[model samples]
Target: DFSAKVIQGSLDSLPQEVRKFVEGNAQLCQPEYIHICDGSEEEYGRLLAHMQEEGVIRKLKKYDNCWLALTDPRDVARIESKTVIITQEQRDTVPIPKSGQSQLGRWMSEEDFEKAFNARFPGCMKGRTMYVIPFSMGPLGSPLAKIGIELTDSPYVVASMRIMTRMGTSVLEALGDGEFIKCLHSVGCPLPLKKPLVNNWACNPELTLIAHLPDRREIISFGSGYGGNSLLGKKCFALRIASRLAKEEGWLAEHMLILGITNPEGKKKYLAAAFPSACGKTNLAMMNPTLPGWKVECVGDDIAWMKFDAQGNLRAINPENGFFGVAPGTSVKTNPNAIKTIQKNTIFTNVAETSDGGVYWEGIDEPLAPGVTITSWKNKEWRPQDEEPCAHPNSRFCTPASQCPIIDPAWESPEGVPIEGIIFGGRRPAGVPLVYEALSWQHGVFVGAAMRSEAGKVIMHDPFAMRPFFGYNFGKYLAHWLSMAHRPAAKLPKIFHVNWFRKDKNGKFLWPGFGENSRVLEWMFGRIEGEDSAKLTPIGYVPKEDALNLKGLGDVNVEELFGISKEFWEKEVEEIDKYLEDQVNADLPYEIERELRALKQRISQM
Candidate 1:
């Protein structure tokens, strides 16, 4: 077991595209190709002949730089084309052999498989495409692992990311031309993965996609890839899609309860828009409303696939994929119900654990204490750290919702519920209190106050977690989101514009916000109910009357009233800006603003 470190530096020197795949995941290495010696030398010979014909012979030598492929002795025939026609049924089955080996037909760890694969497919790198059918980790495992494969191209080649998860459906979520690639680079998808590829894909509505790999499951998806493993589905759907914008072009939503937001008293009602990724849609969904005997159930947390109901009213359905939610904050708040939904034993993709046993969010790190920088803090600080915090890792973080204790026991059909309102929120540009509106369906959500691209006429860039690989149309996705939104003819779900920053009288920024707007949600939603609105106070311990009256709850608690000390707010905001500034697309702040201003100008002209 040589140190991956020695190879790491050389690996970094490879072409950008190759480097991108290797760096994104920790597993990419110098093994050229893989070989499954599954026991039968005769079958191995046949398999070898097929591989030689496929140009994989080049990788089967010591010089191949990319990974190798091979099935174990017991699972030799695992790569046969007949068996490779993987189905949901076979996801749970131990793989058959590609080379007809008995002992190799069982399961093998990624490392062990790599060792065997290296023997057959050795080398520094190869310039052609090679498909290694890993039979052990089931169908999805090899495919997903391939997304991080280190491939080289001397002969003008193309690479694709394939997924074989139980999500049998496909989604053409978002597409990118050169502009989108520019956007990705500007935001930080390493130079290699940020290559120029003419994207051609679309995850149009009504076309369903399902992940029938891990479990026989499905979901209606808009976009995915934010907040780690989550796939963002909406009222019309419940599961989240965490793939790149281009990859979700084929996701589907077959059948489930579809809830449409509505309000009788107001001139316009709103669909339940969700907080941006990694927030608390699931928690709020199951919220025991302050109102007596009135409880709210979830339509969908990450994704809410919606369409017009039979009455021509917009309807939202629960997603087939379970909520991919974070657990750190939930546990901090003592949300036991949510803790019970984590996926069991499965790998909690990308998220990390903290020393305090809390789950941390990747990329969006926060300071544990004022000025005590935690630039490297993982999601464990904000998500659950255990394989099963209370339930399972998959259930707790990215597992199917059926694994959720609260969802199965208490969840009614999301389609059946009436989405009384919608709120579009995110960490926003500082200085604005929350913006609320009862908007028409034409109003599309940009997630937060990201700048609009002048060329694309799109306000948000890459909001959906992952859609880059499939090449879906981004603008059209948003348009469909608006077009299919569930709204009463005259009444629409209240549209809200919220920013998570606060500027002092001197014009400085604060971070974490001390959750001032958390109360705003209470107030905003409360107003929708008007006289019937229950007496709900804000998130903190502030008294309802005291907080609403803009005074101290009782004795004028400075921390709650003024928000975390102004000093902490200022420093934290600065630090957060530094972290996120480079984390977004390639465009600089001024450039983004210029583009946004141009876009707004175009909108005004229109």
Candidate 2:
């Protein structure tokens, strides 16, 4: 119904000649009919031939199955620096009002957006071909999954979609007239030199708009070709929009990684963990376990959909079949499995190249190779002293999860693993405990809802940075959690808070991190099995001195690791109350409000 309206409305808005071309191309992506082309490798080869002939991509001979695609120098980065959420609700957490005259773009109402969008929709595709992609977020036939049709003009997006999702006819078969989100995107490509227009490409650097209408289950994007901006089905829909859908549908969509941990005896437990970006999310997903008989298997590196089964235990599925992961700081040491996954059949963006055909990013290895010219992410050649990062901090690798060495065998199971643990973590150099269990589901919700990171120390005066990877409406996010906790028929997973980035006096890390994090996991699981003991703190329960096995862990001070200062926590509680009241408008559920007050009062007594 929505697709027909979009097609007719969009076609009617175009000039006759252009409408004919768009109509021809759009027919190849019929809503009901499956395209035999379905974007297979052979189709990719055909598209690659066209793209290479048009100079959009160059075949990277360094790796047999690799390609080097360059974006317009002006549009090389993801442009989070200019990204905006144009929502009708002014109280929405991420919304930017249409009235704002700022460097970043503003949010506009859907009615106003249609007027503005239709004016530019036809001209935006003047010299470009639309590539409509049919894809599914989770396993195709899974009851938990959703199908989406992404209409994009960029081959790079098509290629990335192939790597990032289960695309093609099989998805349509599984969908079978079921509801699917309509995602429309354009790169504003090959601008016609004809006239002065409202959507002229060069005039808008911040012209990039990622508009979402969850009510209609639709996304429309224009101007920027970068993945984060143009991949409307990803962070835009999967979390920002799906969070709302999950709330209404009685499930949970989260910015979390799903992993299955197996012990020596072959007993396995699944965990869904949430961490803000750049805080070791992928590393933990593909962790190399140091403890013998302990193994970690990656079900997903990002995003999970969770719900309670009829049996009342929390069950979760990794909505994504692949990893759209940050490339920097990933190495043989941090995650050897990720290094292997990217070696073949990968699309690398904004990372340096080695003398060999391989790619290079910071924190991979120490020194530079001899006589090598590396391409800086800004599309320039660089010497070491250029001091600019060879790869953009947000540089990414798009690879199928099947390529991962530690990927779970049951990754494709329609019925997902039963999640025993749910973790919430952040980058904290101090104050937060290494690992601690929440007192109950209500307390766990508070741990996540009031979760804080010391952003002033890193980013300088930006308090909002702490909330970047959180849900669109934080109060609503907490409300959903409280709803599940209060559900008499549901059994929620155990919740824990962890901080692997805690630092000592000299700003050096206290935890060894990486595979050593399995030690912390063992402690968490031990608590679940009723074999672990912890002392109660103002925030949560911290493990006792002998509770953690420090076997090979050297020079670790137990006092500092589990230490909690009453003074620091008293101040922390006050700030949390203000944040809940001022920022989230204290629109939280009343039960959660009582839980917060109780925590504050308990902290005051501490």
Candidate 3:
């Protein structure tokens, strides 16, 4: 079996002590075969004990069998400054062709990286348990899925992987002599050290290393136990590495959410929408339609893998089985379904605790519980009068998607569902409309390539506004879409761009988001079915007057929601031209260039 080959080969190549250590762990975890235990009650019991022993997590007996973990007091959030990617070329040194290199890191060839890994691998597992976790990225047995084996040292990582991925003996069986990505992880602890240094348990932030070998289909991560760094199956593999594989395989791996919408007539359509971090992507994915007779069901909340079938229809699958979601801002009002998902059998990290045996956050229920004393994420006691957040801003929950009330029943279908639309959105306070449809597939690609975030800077002179591009390598990402569109058998979905944070002069948001966003969804469906008409714009197509339902809505100016400034448009055109030339390396197709020029001309006429 390929698993046995890779396992044995890796062991044989390891230093004698490390090889002996791995062999002993393999034998203990799986006596005869390389199998990981499913998340059963008994296994959870063992994990809880391990958590307590390591002092990394505490039991929340009052919270319905939930567990709480307070990471290093100094490191409560993902340390992006310490993350790195090693490649064959020093690709990150430049802005163009760097593809997702906006952050810190370097590139080293596979050979150089192998030597670097070998030098660091010998004693990396000296006193830690080596866990071999076999997992799948999508529905088990789906042709569009990927299989991987994550061998990690931190039990924390192993537990999170259980919730985030489909793991167990069954996953190994499904893999069945096929190729699988090999993920190696370590907490970077030394042998014979009875306890890991308090500050270094999660990661040696300064020395943390995340290396990917795309050609070998392997990843080696060291020093960090944080989800983003150690959960090789997540961002590390799902987007960073999988995107490369997708580009080569003629499919797409993206940071998008997949949802299926059904109308009263029983007709259903699926959408895959992309949003940058903090853009309410999850809320939209698991939306509970406020409009009567309309329904929303979540297929995948975080990542999507899309490809075209023989019928020329675009199909997509949510690659993950669970939601690693932000904990705050989730309440009965904003996202009751998400709150319900974490009620039981979930892991809470860096969140506040209530005396009533439940969890509490700043926006959970209210600004603060009336008279409740809470345990802060920093492990300190706090009263309602503290006037400070009880939970870390970036606190998170790892819960199963199946726990959500709106989970799609067809979530596990191997064939997946047809994608009728693709939505790209970003957080903008002004200068963007509520929603608009792209003129064509190429124009849609350009819209996504040009989406930008204002970095939450205070609005001042329009020309001085700071803008940050959010999508992954806008140029290369757009080029990939163009290539897919040009495919003879491709049936690309209609595309739209949305902005929910558009604010009025008072700095109050114009749109009442949350459940009310279903109105936007209704408009999208109407457009798709040819039941609605829109006014063509230099950017895209805006809704006709009164296109959105305003019945039962009081004192809201619908016209104001569609405001866009000529000044903003002029600045955007200039910025885009420079971006395509300086950061994109002139790699755009002629159609995209023509689209940009057309937009400029159209904007000038306005």
Candidate 4:
């Protein structure tokens, strides 16, 4: 809540009192003076109530900041000075409270909060504080260059160099707070409309890549990408090259999730999921599956923290705050659930309306409006000249424990349910294919990196989905991925690699590899539980070629499994089936075979 000082500029245009306030708060100019509140329950509620009384509701045209601005489905405005600026008085009275708090806690006025919080934690507290960074393009050349934050200076480096170390064992943390935003600001300037955001007190440095420009109502940043080799003096040279691409395209691409699902018949499988950048990751997650009885749960699409379990197994846990999805190509049928989550009175960019009752991105010469009017599909559309607000892609976001149904409800435990499968995917032109299992875990992890990694030192990201921008040694990356071949809550899940490249037999790409991400998902939906295996070579089970390859990085296939098809399938089935059966016996209503028999009966009747 530290205030910004006039610093080297003039406030002649602002109201007389406001001008004096900015000038008097010159101490705010220094990083030491800023104090970011812990965003506790009591503090947050006070701010919300103040917002209500200050006419901010009508003046700014917003009601619930949490749903609308913080975690809604409507367009997400930039986090800049112009995005939202309230008087000290307004900040003091708002009722919006942070998530956790105690009765002994007292609210601190914006000014007092600054003095108290900073005093409580010196050096660590900078003079400026900001909301979370979101997806927005920074300036042409100023993106993150990977530099690991030193920890305890390291006893771990020796351990890592000598023997492979587990994740936390390495003491390099991503930059946090002041250091982070400062790095971003170096690459780009703050928008004219809003104040420069520092960093969030409740921050996770890993997902802190996106920057906010409230002044322009835009949020931009680099992606969750990693490439190149690390050099001491060179300082992430690969990042410099990435920034070069970012400068030209003004786009960022976060790594995408490729999910694999077996079909109902247990005979077919397919790979499908969204793409990089702000293009419907949230929409797909928010979707209310067209099919029922079967369920769709989140599997850390953006950031999943995986670790070995007590039984020498690995488990994948979501380690993000909220859904870090792109904000485009959303519609009724495509993203109906996402639209419903938006709070009222939020701002968005790039969405436009036409007289034909259709919506398009501003300035696209082509008609983006689907054949049926948006109104004909869902009530989420807003007219350009209409009085009411509309739901658009520039949507809202929240911490992982806030907005998401899964995370919000059950995020305390670090271990999530066992994964059923792995998927590696890209947009394809020959119509997305059904799910297919990958050869193995080594292949799954490799595909994840390949689909998300920079191709041949080439820039492969979008501005809205900025990646790690750090240099990575290909050998080191593979070693890091392969070292832990034997881990999972249960046995390893099936792996599937898919492509959505839209080219016919000809070299021409229909949708290209850039967009068309949804069909990849629809294709997955078609394969879910329909097949027992994607037909890859059932991976992560009893020892076989795929397992051996995973354990030792060699090539193997299904035929190598148990020396026979039905035997491998049946024995392989015994493993995963045992795990599923254990869970069913432990918690489900029916036996595993009972469920399978029921499904078989239903299929036969059909």
Per-prediction count of colliding residue pairs? 170, 2, 2, 101
The list of candidate 4 runs beyond 4 A from truth reads 1-33, 45-63, 66-275, 299-301, 344-401, 404-409, 430-434, 452-471, 486-490, 500-606
TM-score of 3: 0.89
Off by over 4 Å in 2: 1-37, 73-107, 190-204, 366-369, 454-472
Give all TM-scores, in the order shown. 0.38, 0.88, 0.89, 0.42
Query: Please, what are the lDDT tens digits per residue for candidate 3 over residues 1-606?
Result: 214723212444333433443465444333233324455667767877878877878777765668888777554655555444555554422234324333212445567766766655666665455667778999997989998888876778878888898886678667765778778787666465544576335555555667777766777787777777788888878876787678778888877889999988988999988877666878999888888999999999878888899898888888897899988888888998898888887888888887765687877875545776788887789776797788988888989889989999888789888998998887778788999999999888878767776556742111101012111334455567788777887777889998888888889988888888888988888888877568888889988888887566576666667976778889888877766655555445677788889889988998
lDDT against the true structure, each candidate: 0.30, 0.71, 0.73, 0.30
Tens-digit lDDT track of model 2 for 1-606? 123534112444333433443355355322322122275777777776776676666566677577665555456555544443445674454423233322212345667777756654655654455665778888887878888877776778888888888887677556654678777777654345343433112223446666766666777777777776777667777876687788888888887888999878888889988877667889999999999999999999778888888888887888786788888899888889998898788887767766565677788874756776776655577666777888877778888889998889878788888888889887778777799898898888888776655554652111222243333556666777788866767867889999887788898888888999999998877777777578787778888878887789887877777777788777777776755565555355676677788888887886
Q: How would you encode candidate 1's per-residue C-alpha lDDT over 483-599 as one tens digit per residue?
A: 344334523344444444444455444323322333444545555555343222111122234333222223433233334233443443343333224333222233333434443
Model 1: runs farther than 4 Å from truth? 1-271, 279-294, 327-330, 343-396, 403-405, 408-416, 443-471, 478-491, 499-606
Question: How many residue-pair clashes does candidate 2 contain?
Answer: 2
For residues 1-606, what per-residue lDDT tens digits would candidate 4 score against the true structure?
Answer: 223522222345333432333233323222322212222345444544543453221112222433112111111233211111112432221122223321111223346433433432222213332221111111111222222211110111111111111112111122222121111111111123133322110121222133222122221222111101101011121132222222333321223332223323443222224345343345444544433232344443443323344664334433232343333454445554444443321222223433452334322234444553322111245444655444343432222223334322223233433334445454433323322444455545433433322232342322112223311222223334444453343345445554433343565533322112333343434334442322332322222222211222133222321232344234333443333333223222233244344323433442
Error of 3 at 483 (Å): 1.4
Ranking by TM-score, best first? 3, 2, 4, 1
Cα displacement (Å) at residue 115, model 1: 28
